[PDB]
Amino acid sequence: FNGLTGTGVLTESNKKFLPFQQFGRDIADTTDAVRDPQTLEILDITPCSFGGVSVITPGTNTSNQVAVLYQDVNCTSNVFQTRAGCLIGAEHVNNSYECDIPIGAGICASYQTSQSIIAYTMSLGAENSCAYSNNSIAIPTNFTISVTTEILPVSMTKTSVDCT
Amino acid sequence: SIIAYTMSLGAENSCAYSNNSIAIPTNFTISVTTEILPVSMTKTSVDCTMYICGDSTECSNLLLQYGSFCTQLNRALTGIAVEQDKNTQEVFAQVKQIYKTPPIKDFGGFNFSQILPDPSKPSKRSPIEDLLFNKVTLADAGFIKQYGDCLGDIAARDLICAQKFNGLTVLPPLLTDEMIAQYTSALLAGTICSGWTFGAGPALQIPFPMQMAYRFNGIGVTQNVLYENQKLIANQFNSAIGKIQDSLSSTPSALGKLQDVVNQNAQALNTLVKQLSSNFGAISSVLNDILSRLDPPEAEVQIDRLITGRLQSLQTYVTQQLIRAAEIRASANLAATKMSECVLGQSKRVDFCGKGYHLMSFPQSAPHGVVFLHVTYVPAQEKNFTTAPAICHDGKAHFPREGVFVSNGTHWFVTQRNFYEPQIITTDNTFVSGNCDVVIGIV
Amino acid sequence: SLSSTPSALGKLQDVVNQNAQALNTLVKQLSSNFGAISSVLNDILSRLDPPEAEVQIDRLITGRLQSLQTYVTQQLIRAAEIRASANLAATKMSECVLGQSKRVDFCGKGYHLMSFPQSAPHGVVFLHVTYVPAQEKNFTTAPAICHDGKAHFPREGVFVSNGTHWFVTQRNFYEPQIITTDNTFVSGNCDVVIGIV
Amino acid sequence: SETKCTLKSFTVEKGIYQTSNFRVQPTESIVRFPNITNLCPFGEVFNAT
Ligand SMILES: *[C@@H]1O[C@H](CO)[C@@H](O[C@@H]2O[C@H](CO)[C@@H](O)[C@H](O)[C@H]2NC(C)=O)[C@H](O)[C@H]1NC(C)=O
Ligand SMILES: *[C@@H]1O[C@H](CO)[C@@H](O[C@@H]2O[C@H](CO)[C@@H](O)[C@H](O)[C@H]2NC(C)=O)[C@H](O)[C@H]1NC(C)=O
């Protein structure tokens, strides 16, 4: 546009400029809005999709079927829109499950049986209930003994480098 | 006018060191205070080639001369993002049994309505949580972008579409706000119905006033105090909670810690983009100007200069993010510890679970963090009494079995250390050992 | 369990793998030209006159040095994390092995009894032995018992009952005792306590 | 295949991996200038009466 170059999608803007202003600016001064040189109107310049692509793998020794997530992409087979990107190749189901391979925004994927990769809202835990009452108490009558394991690193490999 | 003055260090105060003289509290109050800790950073990532080259072919070919640099930058940022979800999970997902919030039942006068989720709202937040939520302001306006605001408002100083332009992104959390609210609700339901037993193993049902009786014995206040002062205790509790919501509303600085994490991370990205526009000694920061004005080898010199400039800015950015990440991890680790020791138990650590004697606590969620309500016992009105280490009777020395010997001049009584409740000194209240000659100051 | 699930020791494996990658990255980066004619220093010297060879070398030095500084900075950061882990491990040994900790879910899950350390490559493994309540029953309870108008409170426990009788038990185990004057203390009358039986 | 090359392995463990970036390309070159209509009678100097 005149002396302004770049790449993006050109749409109508809802802003107006003073008559002598030709270009506008975002938070870090990217040139974005422009008055059209022949029919001055404010044209909106917005960047094209550019997010990452991730591959969801159920494990090589299980299946070579994968599902693919596009991080900033609008979906506009088994295409499902998540809040974390457009998911291709996975069957969304309405049952909640514990997470295996996470996607984001409450959505996880897993491999389930006629097998496929499925998408679901994560379960947050077992449903339970404490029967609160003002005159009733639960008291243990027996016990068990548990042994558990906790692991902590203590040291890192010691190294040295001859700079020259 | 502006004045300068010497700092005061604290209120001048005093007590008298004095032998055979003690003070014993005669009244108390229940105080509830608030502690706030950050849990996570916004998860982000950067496309190193979009940032450095902007898809210029000549730049990419020169960027390839610095082979592992993108890998290292990308891995460092990825690692940070991974930790941010782990930090969140450790702080909140301590109990995998979700106890549903009970209908309000008879809790002996204890009112939890500002703590528990409000059933009428679109977001299942307690009145306090909704307040904390409304007060913190975020620049991270979504992850998958809507185009209503992105395309409507242009040249209006926005951020997340600007980040898109430069190859910078913001990633969604794995665990969403409603899910966090559900974990918080489960912990609260658990605590109110079963005390700490659900933390240790099975959730045992315990009448609420009995949970309190045990918590008082844990401090050192004999439980009969609770049953007799139950109405006072419940009223002070209920009052304190109401005061907290009002305090949070009126004191905007309360959430400064969480707002600070957000502000600093936003600035780091805004700075990174601004650095991008700088020449770094080049004839132009724009690769296309460099190319249009120059033959191939001259452009290569100017392009390589900009690659150094942009790459150095990215290394700076990542290093700072790693440092901040270490600190947020430390905060999250502390928060997780506090929840286990203050919420799922009754820690005796001093100044660890609020000021005063820890009685109990309740978590509330907040954007990028956790807020704890710490309920503590604090002695109040007190009286001066005469004391002695032992009572001399028939030549034998009698020591309190559990308490202090105290008198009002004429008569000696025995009381518990933290709350005046005089008993007649009897043999059932004493330990006997040694004679009256060995103890100094025996009466 | 340790034999069956190889991921259990991933924490120690990760420390090792990360250091190995950092070292391998440093070496591989060494081979890049960084805009230079050649990464082989001897090639630059052999085929160039002094003036240009010096320029080409300055470029390679800049590149290699940036790689070393990047490497070290990352190692310092990793070092901070390993120190933090070690400090915690030392704390746990003092409180879990050399004593009995009451910190909840700090030293094993459930109520802690004792612990035993084991060694491991680059780290420590703790075995924590804890007490966990199991079978439990539904009982009636009350804050106090009304005797002759005086209020009696459990000395150490809960007043709990079955369909016909009241007993006093210890909090963590249902072992009913007859309620006697030695298992209770008296304070206040029967009118002040709510729910006295 | 992209995941295998990315991870330098002929075997890929269960999980989610970022392997590439998606980039939308432009389809055409559009240049805009005003109508201008600011020309001088250069050719009338040549084609003088
Ligand atoms: C301990 O202090 C409380 C106040 O915090 C006293 O309770 C108040 O007593 C007055 C006079 O009867 C009432 O008007 C107030 O409404 C009470 N306040 C509350 C919250 O109930 C209490 O009496 C004092 N106790 C002792 C032993 O001194
Ligand atoms: C628990 O406390 C809340 C106050 O926090 C009481 O609810 C208030 O009731 C008044 C009307 O009397 C309303 O105007 C307020 O908006 C309510 N506040 C809230 C937070 O809901 C509630 O009644 C008390 N409940 C019990 C059992 O004591």
Ligand SMILES: *[C@@H]1O[C@H](CO)[C@@H](O[C@@H]2O[C@H](CO)[C@@H](O)[C@H](O)[C@H]2NC(C)=O)[C@H](O)[C@H]1NC(C)=O
């Ligand atoms: C201070 O100590 C004296 C001595 O024990 C208390 O006196 C008692 O007062 C009651 C009520 O008048 C009498 O029935 C008792 O017989 C008195 N006791 C004795 C030993 O004579 C006095 O009440 C105490 N004062 C306070 C505030 O505790």
Ligand SMILES: *[C@@H]1O[C@H](CO)[C@@H](O[C@@H]2O[C@H](CO)[C@@H](O)[C@H](O)[C@H]2NC(C)=O)[C@H](O)[C@H]1NC(C)=O
């Ligand atoms: C509550 O526990 C008591 C004590 O064990 C039970 O009473 C005893 O029952 C046996 C028969 O099984 C009799 O021989 C004893 O003489 C009873 N003891 C007393 C003090 O009466 C009682 O049956 C249990 N109640 C319920 C409803 O299970």
Ligand SMILES: *[C@@H]1O[C@H](CO)[C@@H](O)[C@H](O)[C@H]1NC(C)=O
């Ligand atoms: C260019 O021509 C169009 C069509 O006649 C007219 O509407 C417009 O106003 C003209 N331009 C300028 C730059 O003033």
Ligand SMILES: *[C@@H]1O[C@H](CO)[C@@H](O)[C@H](O)[C@H]1NC(C)=O
């Ligand atoms: C995709 O575009 C449609 C308009 O055609 C819009 O309504 C929808 O919200 C968009 N979804 C995403 C994830 O961008």
Ligand SMILES: *[C@@H]1O[C@H](CO)[C@@H](O)[C@H](O)[C@H]1NC(C)=O
């Ligand atoms: C106790 O005595 C000290 C002087 O030693 C005095 O300052 C204090 O106010 C007295 N406190 C009470 C409760 O009487």
Ligand SMILES: *[C@@H]1O[C@H](CO)[C@@H](O)[C@H](O)[C@H]1NC(C)=O
């Ligand atoms: C308490 O201190 C006073 C003043 O020094 C002294 O006369 C008195 O004997 C002391 N009594 C005891 C039991 O130490």
Ligand SMILES: *[C@@H]1O[C@H](CO)[C@@H](O)[C@H](O)[C@H]1NC(C)=O
């Ligand atoms: C007591 O009974 C209720 C049902 O009324 C049940 O939910 C609860 O788990 C029972 N508690 C014990 C200790 O059996």
Ligand SMILES: *[C@@H]1O[C@H](CO)[C@@H](O)[C@H](O)[C@H]1NC(C)=O
């Ligand atoms: C428990 O609640 C019931 C109402 O459901 C009431 O009748 C009873 O008196 C209460 N018990 C105690 C000890 O407060």
